[PDB]
Amino acid sequence: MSTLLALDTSTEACSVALLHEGRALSHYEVIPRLHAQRLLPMVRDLLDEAGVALSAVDAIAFGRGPGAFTGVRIAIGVVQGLAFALQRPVLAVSDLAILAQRAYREQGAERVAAAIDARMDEVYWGCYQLQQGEMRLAGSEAVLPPERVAVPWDAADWFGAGTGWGYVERMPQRPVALDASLLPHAEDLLSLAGFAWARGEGVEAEQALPVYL
Template identity: 50%
Template sequence: MAKILALDTSTDACSVALYLDGEVKEDFRVIPRQHTQQLLPMVQAILADAELAIADLDAIAFGRGPGSFAGIRIATGVAQGLAFAAELPLVPVSTLAAIALQQHQQGHERVIAALDARMDEVYWGAFRLDAGLPVLVDQERVDAPANVALPDEHVWHAAGSGWRYLEDMSAAIQSAVNEPDVECYPRAGSMASLAAAAFEKGDMVAPEDALPVYLRDEVAWKKKDQQ
């Protein structure tokens, strides 16, 4: 089986995980503004515990966003540096999909994952469970809370820090969502599992082609192009 290292620094949490022999080992810490200092030591520790070197891996996964601009750049840069040095492919993983997978594992088949995007906006995406994995419905978005919408009439579970804006969302959302899991962070452990599935399908990129996904930047450029 594939040996995959996963990294995430997209929120106040910093996490690393190792997918090995079908099992996931993870180091997860909520350490705001300490990602730069802690990420590499965490990587070194989890590899040392498994008696592995970077060169022993098959791929490296990272949280490609959306999330904190600075945080996403940290994970992307570290993953690229490690991959270049060991000539490994990278697997970019959606932070929202990572949240959705955690909720799927708790028994929720349909999940709307949302992260606080600051500036009174949220990053969000709806995911349904298919063959044990989250599948994105439509696309990931950045919106004002009032614009978050239910994809259909099914029951949807809500998770992620963006749901702290629930009171600013539509009446339809407020009536449909009950006790969202606002403390659910993207985690490297979930990303490692998603990356393993992607690796098996050959969904990897070269280090130089691995890009963060900001969403807000993409929306800004689209609006500019439409002017």
């Protein structure tokens, strides 16, 4: 039924995805910070390949951060512009959540501690737990030095996801399994956006905003 567009430029990965008639399509490229250069062309190519008009889009999902300061904000701008002009709602979704949901798609983890490298020798951190198909946040998200990091579980199997885990040796807990290369991917944003769209969580374009931690 619902046609949803998903954009993420919060990290080194620039990706875009489209839900249309139950089918999901994605483009994903890693570049460094040429995002402004490549985000629209990608939307254009995806719509073109799918044969979907932009007017067909019911809502635009975006990675709201945390991640790169300028990166995140490029996504925000494009999305703001698109949704205001179309007069459609937007869905803000955490990049830590996107990480979590990807680790669930690719590695089958149901309990993920998402961590993203951050400026000034901290990392962004949020732990997620599968609930009815959706990785949902457990506790709160934060920017912490890797030393002060902690899980909300006890004996439980969990996964370390994201480039924050480059700091694993400096961190209290080590998980049974881990992936420190993993980036937010728009395909997974699209899944999360679906759950949010089902609960009707969409907002006006003016409120498409980045997070502060």
